[PDB]
Design an enzyme around this catalytic site. Structure first.
Site, mmCIF file in Angstrom:
data_model
loop_
_atom_site.group_PDB
_atom_site.id
_atom_site.type_symbol
_atom_site.label_atom_id
_atom_site.label_comp_id
_atom_site.label_asym_id
_atom_site.label_seq_id
_atom_site.Cartn_x
_atom_site.Cartn_y
_atom_site.Cartn_z
ATOM 1 N N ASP A 81 7.005 -5.441 6.475
ATOM 2 C CA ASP A 81 5.881 -4.614 6.075
ATOM 3 C C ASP A 81 4.762 -4.615 7.118
ATOM 4 O O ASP A 81 4.676 -5.490 7.985
ATOM 5 C CB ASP A 81 5.328 -5.064 4.701
ATOM 6 N N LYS A 82 3.896 -3.619 7.007
ATOM 7 C CA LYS A 82 2.758 -3.489 7.887
ATOM 8 C C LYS A 82 1.526 -3.263 7.004
ATOM 9 O O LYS A 82 1.589 -2.556 5.984
ATOM 10 C CB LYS A 82 2.967 -2.315 8.874
ATOM 11 N N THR A 121 -4.122 4.504 1.764
ATOM 12 C CA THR A 121 -2.806 5.133 1.699
ATOM 13 C C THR A 121 -2.481 5.703 0.328
ATOM 14 O O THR A 121 -1.952 6.811 0.224
ATOM 15 C CB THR A 121 -1.716 4.135 2.126
ATOM 16 N N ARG A 169 -14.876 -4.136 -5.195
ATOM 17 C CA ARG A 169 -15.346 -4.321 -3.807
ATOM 18 C C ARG A 169 -15.713 -3.005 -3.109
ATOM 19 O O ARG A 169 -16.767 -2.906 -2.449
ATOM 20 C CB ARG A 169 -14.311 -5.077 -2.982
ATOM 21 N N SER A 184 -7.091 -10.602 -0.153
ATOM 22 C CA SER A 184 -6.623 -9.277 -0.597
ATOM 23 C C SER A 184 -5.342 -8.794 0.090
ATOM 24 O O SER A 184 -4.385 -8.362 -0.575
ATOM 25 C CB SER A 184 -7.720 -8.229 -0.418
ATOM 26 N N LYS A 188 -0.962 -9.454 -1.662
ATOM 27 C CA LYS A 188 -0.022 -8.349 -1.791
ATOM 28 C C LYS A 188 1.256 -8.562 -0.994
ATOM 29 O O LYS A 188 2.346 -8.272 -1.484
ATOM 30 C CB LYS A 188 -0.677 -7.043 -1.358
HETATM 31 C C1 LIG Z 1 -10.240 -4.653 4.051
HETATM 32 C C2 LIG Z 1 -8.921 -4.599 3.268
HETATM 33 C C3 LIG Z 1 -7.873 -3.786 3.694
HETATM 34 N N1 LIG Z 1 -6.741 -3.760 2.986
HETATM 35 C C4 LIG Z 1 -6.597 -4.504 1.880
HETATM 36 O O1 LIG Z 1 -5.455 -4.474 1.172
HETATM 37 N N2 LIG Z 1 -7.585 -5.298 1.443
HETATM 38 C C5 LIG Z 1 -8.747 -5.361 2.108
HETATM 39 O O2 LIG Z 1 -9.717 -6.178 1.630
#
Ligand SMILES: Cc1c[nH]c(=O)[nH]c1=O
Ligand SMILES: Cc1c[nH]c(=O)[nH]c1=O
Lengths: 446, 446
Positions: A81-82, A121, A169, A184, A188
């Protein structure tokens, strides 16, 4: 500790224990933490910070707040993943996910919506009628079976705690926090069960870090915490003297992504897709070098296979098969027709003769945000046709009165302040015309 | 500017314009400001502060977020109020509102609920079955006509922006902010159209700001901003390390308030009621000196007239007339029967011989909060029978094994930590027994 005491601890610059962090994350997930308590915690963290241990525990708590993804054993090596920290006009992910599937990889991408003045995205994909970003762990199996890829959002089963906090946020000025960003992104990617991760960390205004060294600290944190949590991570530090490609927005960025998968589109966009893709293929052991990997990704852009995989992903995620096919095999003009269009268009003209030195991304992001391409509150719907197209290249010599930016807007006008803000984005000089520099991309390796 | 921009400005330690503050307050009132945005703004303000001009504009915006109260011309001089910054076991207001009514004053008190570890008058009144804290501007006219007093809460017509923020502040560790406290107190008092206001600010363990210098500064700010906004304000800075009286909680504090209106109860409670009442009567020009006013208030406590006014206020605000009469004319034992009672009681015994030097208010507040006397989230119902009774005086010599505290609890039994926290509240020494000192009371003027 109930919520009010946890906030008070952080507010005073105190360290939160593993138990504290997990308690707060639990309260976020079950609804016990009310909005105001989420915002106050986030701001306390934003102003008072977190140490590496806190950041690491927060990353784990967010990852474990939903389900962990399990995949067939045979896929273990194919899973890559990227992720981006954010960049104006960065639509690499729309192209890279299906391109990597075409290279025999599996890309279970859990992504994000907009965040501050940077688009996400998930919002871009929602300009495609019927595209469903919410997909169960078992549905994600089917998608990876069908297209080799998927792009999904956080949900009740997947990193729900990041979803809640991310949404908050966005609209509370708590995006630009090192521990929050780290937790964050990594939460994921941790649940995806990847063999390799590349994180693109960009700098220069527009970006979360207008500075290379700042961004460097974030890149090193992502890689260091990643590794300590069992994940093979590399970061790429990237800079640009313009937005990526020509299109900023949502429908517009899908359109440009489709161009790239046609074997066309702007060079910077293609350069970054191939650079980051090849880094990943090298990192996962699927290419001997980054340069071999980049050529492999380029080939997928050129033989229609990335585009083919993208079409499969669209249909598998709720897009009507007839529309998905009509969109992917269609001409630029047919695509514009199928995707949301802003009601109005205006072009800004060059005030004088000059070579384009730079198109400043930040003023463009801010104005498009106010026109409906961003949110002032969570859950607020976007105007997906809104955006802007750069009509000139950096390094290009242009005459006065030549259009350099087309703005797509739903209202009658740009306000004076926003008209002025966009004009100051265009930097002109007396210099001789030059080739558009290809994005800076330095690797930070595990 | 939009909210994330407003929050961002304050987050960075920037000053908010009059327009900015009014915009934020407006967004709070109409629902545009989501919970998370309210929490983040409140924490930004809590950590980064506000200057006097900001504080003043925030006071005005909160006052102007609902209706201004208008009263008959003949009442202009009779209109008086008292407000506290907070104080563990402070039930002065339950007694002083009706007592002042009995002295020929009008007391249109807009009050508040709990805030952090300190109980609020509105929650105490709600242990009285049928008592309605929400009363319209025109209903308030009727109350002042019938009882000469009322105690009401913020609502959609009355300072709605304070109600929202107050409820959030309670549970987000944003209570102890100088500008937030000033704006909160003064906005309520400004809409009542008063001829005189006394604000009781404490320092010591029982207070919001146990530090004397923090409390003096708050007192001077309340008076200075008050005066600049057209209000005749005095502050009383009172040192208090122990709870006021013997009862901490809600039903229990109503019960003790009723004892004081019986012409009885603990001396410190009566001393503070008469001190603050007399200050007020002097300040409004109804008494020649503070001492003449205090004697006037004391007389109202002694002849049943304060109790009479309180009974009228209860019935006028929804309490069944038969219950209001039964409660006010009833014995202490009958009152306990009519008001909520915790299911269980336990007494803590003196660990040794000693003179009570002190009963620390803070550890008591914190434990009772956890037992249901306080909130971990907004809109959470309280356990109004929960609380504690001091069974000894400060200055009293006591033997080991003698009960010093009775805890009224709804749950299972005191844990190891909360049981230990309560025990450390009792300070014993070798000293000779002494008279319980009466409250320190220093008056701050403009
Ligand atoms: C800045 C940022 C980019 N992408 C994310 O998934 N979380 C974040 O906090
Ligand atoms: C501390 C405090 C007490 N009372 C109020 O009405 N507001 C406050 O902020």
């Amino acid at each position: 500790k109930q919520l009010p005491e946890l906030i008070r601890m952080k507010r005073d610059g105190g360290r939160l224990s593993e138990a504290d962090i997990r308690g707060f994350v639990a309260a976020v997930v079950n609804g016990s933490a009310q909005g105001a308590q989420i915002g106050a915690m986030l701001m306390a963290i934003r102003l008072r910070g977190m140490d590496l241990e806190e950041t690491s525990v927060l990353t784990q708590a967010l990852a474990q707040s939903g389900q962990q993804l399990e995949w067939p054993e045979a896929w273990r090596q194919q899973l890559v993943d990227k992720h981006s920290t954010g960049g104006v006009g960065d639509k690499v992910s729309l192209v890279l996910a299906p391109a990597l599937a075409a290279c025999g990889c599996k890309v279970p991408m859990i992504s994000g919506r907009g965040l501050g003045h940077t688009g996400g995205t998930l919002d871009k994909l929602e300009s495609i009628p019927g595209f469903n970003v919410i997909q169960s762990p078992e549905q994600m199996q089917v998608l990876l079976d069908q297209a080799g890829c998927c792009i999904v959002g956080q949900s009740e089963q997947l990193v729900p705690a990041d979803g809640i906090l991310y949404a908050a946020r966005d609209v509370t000025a708590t995006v630009d926090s090192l521990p929050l960003i780290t937790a964050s992104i990594l939460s994921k990617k941790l649940v995806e069960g990847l063999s390799a991760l590349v994180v693109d960390v960009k700098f220069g205004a527009g970006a979360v870090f207008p500075n290379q060294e700042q961004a460097r600290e974030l890149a090193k944190t992502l890689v260091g915490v990643g590794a300590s949590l069992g994940l093979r991570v590399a970061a790429a530090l990237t800079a640009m003297d313009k937005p990526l490609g020509r299109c900023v927005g949502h429908a517009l960025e899908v359109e440009e992504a489709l161009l790239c998968m046609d074997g066309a589109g702007p060079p910077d966009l293609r350069d970054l897709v191939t650079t980051l893709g090849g880094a990943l293929l090298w990192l996962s052991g699927h290419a001997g070098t980054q340069a071999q990997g980049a050529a492999r990704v380029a080939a997928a852009l050129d033989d229609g296979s990335a585009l083919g995989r993208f079409e499969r992903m669209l249909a598998a995620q709720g897009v009507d098969p007839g529309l998905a096919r009509a969109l992917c095999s269609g001409s630029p003009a047919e695509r514009r027709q199928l995707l949301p269009r802003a009601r109005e268009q205006e072009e800004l003209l060059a005030p004088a003769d000059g070579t384009v030195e730079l198109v400043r991304a930040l003023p463009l992001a801010l104005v498009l945000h106010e026109l409906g391409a961003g949110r002032s509150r969570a859950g607020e719907p976007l105007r997906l046709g809104v955006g802007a197209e750069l009509l000139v290249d950096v390094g290009q010599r242009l005459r006065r009165g030549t259009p350099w930016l087309r703005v797509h807007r739903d209202g009658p006008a740009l306000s004076g302040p926003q008209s002025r803000a966009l004009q100051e984005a265009l930097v002109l000089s007396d210099r001789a015309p030059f080739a558009a520099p290809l994005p800076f991309a330095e690797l930070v390796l595990p």
